[PDB]
Symmetry: D3
Subunit: 238 residues, 6 copies
Amino acid sequence: DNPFDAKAWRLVDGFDDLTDITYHRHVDDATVRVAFNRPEVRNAFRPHTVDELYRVLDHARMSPDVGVVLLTGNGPSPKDGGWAFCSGGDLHILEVQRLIRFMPKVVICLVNGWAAGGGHSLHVVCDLTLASREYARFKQTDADFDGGYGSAYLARQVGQKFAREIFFLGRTYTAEQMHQMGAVNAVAEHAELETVGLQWAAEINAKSPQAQRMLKFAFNLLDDGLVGQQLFAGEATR
Amino acid sequence: DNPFDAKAWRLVDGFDDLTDITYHRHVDDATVRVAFNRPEVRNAFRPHTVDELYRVLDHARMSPDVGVVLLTGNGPSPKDGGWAFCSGGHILEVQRLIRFMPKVVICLVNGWAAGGGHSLHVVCDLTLASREYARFKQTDADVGSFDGGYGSAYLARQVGQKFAREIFFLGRTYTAEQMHQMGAVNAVAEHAELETVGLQWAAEINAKSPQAQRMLKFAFNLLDDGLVGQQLFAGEATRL
Amino acid sequence: NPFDAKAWRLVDGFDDLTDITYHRHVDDATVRVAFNRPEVRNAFRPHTVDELYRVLDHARMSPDVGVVLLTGNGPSPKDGGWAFCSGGHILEVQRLIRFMPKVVICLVNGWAAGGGHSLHVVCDLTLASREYARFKQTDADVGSFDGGYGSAYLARQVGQKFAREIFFLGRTYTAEQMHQMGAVNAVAEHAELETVGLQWAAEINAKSPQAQRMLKFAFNLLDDGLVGQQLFAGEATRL
Amino acid sequence: NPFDAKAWRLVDGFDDLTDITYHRHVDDATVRVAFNRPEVRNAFRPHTVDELYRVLDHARMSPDVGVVLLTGNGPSPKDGGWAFCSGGHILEVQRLIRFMPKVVICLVNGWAAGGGHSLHVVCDLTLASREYARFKQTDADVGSFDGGYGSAYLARQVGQKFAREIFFLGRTYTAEQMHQMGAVNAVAEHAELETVGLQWAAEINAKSPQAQRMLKFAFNLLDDGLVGQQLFAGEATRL
Amino acid sequence: DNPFDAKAWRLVDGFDDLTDITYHRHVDDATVRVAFNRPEVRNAFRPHTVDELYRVLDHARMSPDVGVVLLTGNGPSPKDGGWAFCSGGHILEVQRLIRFMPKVVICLVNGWAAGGGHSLHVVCDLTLASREYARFKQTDADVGSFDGGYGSAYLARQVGQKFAREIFFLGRTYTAEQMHQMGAVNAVAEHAELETVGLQWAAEINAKSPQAQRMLKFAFNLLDDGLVGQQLFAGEATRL
Amino acid sequence: DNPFDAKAWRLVDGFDDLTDITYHRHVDDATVRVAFNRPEVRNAFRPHTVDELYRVLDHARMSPDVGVVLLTGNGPSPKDGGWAFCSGGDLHILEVQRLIRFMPKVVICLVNGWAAGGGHSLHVVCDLTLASREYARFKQTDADFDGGYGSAYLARQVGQKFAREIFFLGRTYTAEQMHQMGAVNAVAEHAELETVGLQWAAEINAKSPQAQRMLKFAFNLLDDGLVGQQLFAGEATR
Ligand SMILES: O=S(=O)(O)CCCN1CCN(CCO)CC1
Ligand SMILES: O=S(=O)(O)CCCN1CCN(CCO)CC1
């Protein structure tokens, strides 16, 4: 029961050299799948991982025919059978966060397992998050810090009380709990996570691309100040 | 089982010419009922509808003895028995009128709330919805159009950035209960009682210091309206 | 009772307090600050605010204290009821709570109305008694109103729709309802409120103090503008 | 005189105006809206505000008008003095000026005090008579005060230090001094004020109208929060 | 030619123990004079100095009959004849006290205003400076230290982003006239008259409605203090 | 009397292929010189120009030993002897603006001549601007639009009245006029522009680098919302 359905994806030309990240383009949809490929180490990212992740996402950003990015983690671990989206630290990861934030495409994080530390922050900055009911685990390790989108932005999803709780105590939360607080859009059966992700991607791609771009930047504008204004006005310039 | 109770309302004088909107004043309370009156077309609004809506709301804004505005849709559809609050297409001006008026505007979603109709509910101070028939759907995106202001950004100040983005990006249909869970709907009520509950909420609001209610609304607006918000709040302070 | 005397010690220099009690945990870097006027539902009078400010300020300057538990003593000797704070310079207490480099957890053991409700809102976290926590924003029907952290900030917790509801109608809500809306972190059984509070305090204190301070100001920075930047930048200036 | 009758035509539907004059340029997409109560230094009474609102609103809806010149007629028949507006719903006029998709240029031909000063502040641009422009923020000594666009927004033009000076002391300033601080775009000889205003209006109207609208809301967006976003986004929705 | 006029001031009762700060009340006006009293060291402040400064300012904040605070430095240096307002090193708390107090704080820069001393001038509501001896220099950067709050960011709200960045990045020394041109100094005055001019400004401020002045200050602060700014302004409104 | 003093600069290894941009590293200082190299066309930038400019600036951003970036235009025009920093449009230029905005180094724009359209916007987003007294010409062409840093940010330098004027009328301004309004830090003799630029760079580099980084982000934080918070908090994380 692996979330990954190989038949639905094709490798993107120009990335045979990837080792820490897998990059696929859907066989029919204007959707790509970017995933951490280090299950043995719970998909923790090392400097090299960040470089590939940035390269891949930047390429997706510039792909005219791609309207949705599915960001997830491959699994399970061959070592213990566990599941992880991204366990965090082992080009800065902050640049990856901004790339996700600023790209004119909807980025959906598919939390298939542990999402801790920097991995948790990556999920927070994504536009939407779908999570495995059985294996998704949310834990902000930091304080055990990310004073940017990792934290402050979480408050714009679950509220100041819950956000402070998540960070100050660093407890572990399930997909359902995070859904109740407002940080997870929907909970899905583990085996169905990616299938549900592709359904959401399809509904998004079925609408006006220009409208989707404008909307994303309109939502960003609320908290990104001048940068947010630049991107929205930039798209207004057509 | 219709939400409207004829015995509780009286038409406002001076609006006999309204065709797309009904405007009533409660027989006893400082509350008015503004409703879309085109059930035959799922209360979609045409340019003429917006003009009447603006006129009516503007009149309510200036009515010294009115403290609460109930915004809803008349129903059901004469030709399908369906319910609708407003199914969408100056409207931006209507949004600001609702936003800036020193009175609490409660949207009573009795049916479909789509497109511009959905945005109207979002900008209202409070929203109550019909459990059985309220239906929320942000259709702008799949219409090529979009509201990058109070309709969208402000929704995020109600349900959070994740849910707001979902609502707009996918344009799915949600029930009163779902929208209530996300935080965009204050409470769910039986369809037949939507207005009865609305009047009870209006009564509780009107039972308090009007000056305090005005100050509070502008205090809540100030958080996101920047200088405009400051002007309205400080405006009240200067008055004091 | 919520209170477990065996776990607290009085703080030297405060036996002159009459409206507030101030304790230091026997082991944890945590203090307990509580309203001490149960006979009148822990409402605060000018004298109460002075003691509260003094106590909180002292806690703010205590280097070995990382968490402040703010609650109300009970029950009322007059009716057996429970109250955290029933309401009425209190604005200065709010800022003290907001700006202090320590996590302030409000433990709502009973009624939290008016200014009492506003105090809970400004605290970093809130835990509430399932059986006795009662939330009610009274001001409006009294002609008064808190247009600062009491109201605006509540919206940053439960959203604009619910926040406006809470203030405009002034209804009473349970711990559970408030938890559902997002202003209450967790609900606890009355007798366990403080025990749960100490467990949360322990988890907080078990982490890097510098990190916790930085995080609190990072969360404040989102809404405190220049003041928020000053505190975050200042905290960074240390490192 | 500042006014050149040969260049303006009355606007149909406004011969009932008494406190305001409303003209349309014979050639340019520009209108002239002016206070018409020189005998009392163009101070505004409730009736004046109504006409002003009506006129500005009409200008706002005129598709072929890209620039609004806001000034005051003169001189005073009683003392030969000059005034733009001496002060006292006026808040609604401010928003109309702020939100209309047209560039509003205030031409200060004389005294600009109290509400009159606030009107100049909220306009997009200000040109002033070197010999007669007099800026004075009176409110404070009257017990009154404009805590919105009149004050806060002035700070976005001359900076926090100068803005506080202007309001706290309520001193009178010349066109030159105000230009030096940043609230006045340019100083002009009295007789040339309107001629210069039309030249600026012409340069504005010679460019893409859609671009000018977008730019105005882009500048507003910096300080008008959600309202500013609504207007910019709405303007974009067109394209 | 000393700025201070003994005949115009009277010591405040209860502060005989001050060593690093002087605190006077004007003989007739609702104005106080708070000054750094360590000329021998270019009025640099040590921890003890900050404690006294905070105490003094806090007392002024609570003085109902005081509407204006004049913040300056005593001089000249006993051992070099040089002038200094404050040459720099809890101070953040002093900044907020100046920022939040419902009274106008005018900084009179009589000499060197460097490091923390420069930041104090920036946070004051108004600044008047000695033409001959005022010297502005943000030395933090070349000290390895920095003020990323009111000392820096807020300076940008006075001189604009370009000039503010220049002042901090290069740490050059500027005169009263230069700082006035950039917008951080309200007016330049003859050294010997700095305080005389300061009292004239204080008199004009005090001649107006105290309530209005309080409201205005908080209205100006609201622009950049977010929720804190709202709390203080709304605070006054509730009072009303 | 050319502002460029060849003896003081060395080409940066790895950029012999540049055609629209020149990239030098000072012989002694931790300062680089990035300049538009299309004088014949008044240094207008074409898509290829933006690509090189971005590559160069990104490399400067990642150079540990570089603390200051001098951004200017080479000249004069071999066609008419005129001077230009950048005349504007002929990887998006918006990405270049953000790169300048976000890099932890002080970027000084040396306006040696015409600064129009996108060229003017580039000067506005730079941390500091020094301009040639005889040849600097500021003109916002757009409306004849940049609703981001190009415009809104200008208002944070010269005030709302002047900013609106500059954009609505699109008039041409001198170094001195722009200096009076607050958008130009200092005016310098044309032949001395770069020498003065190196002096400013030296004073900046003479201070604590960590302090300079913190300060720049503290100034940005005022208007960059969450993005600004992310960068400042990111540097706070050390
Ligand atoms: O709008 S704010 O980002 O300032 C605060 C968000 C408030 N809410 C957070 C979480 N829930 C999510 C839906 O239950 C509701 C409101
Ligand atoms: O602080 S703001 O960015 O909102 C407005 C800037 C105000 N000023 C602009 C230009 N001058 C520059 C110095 O003369 C002074 C103040």
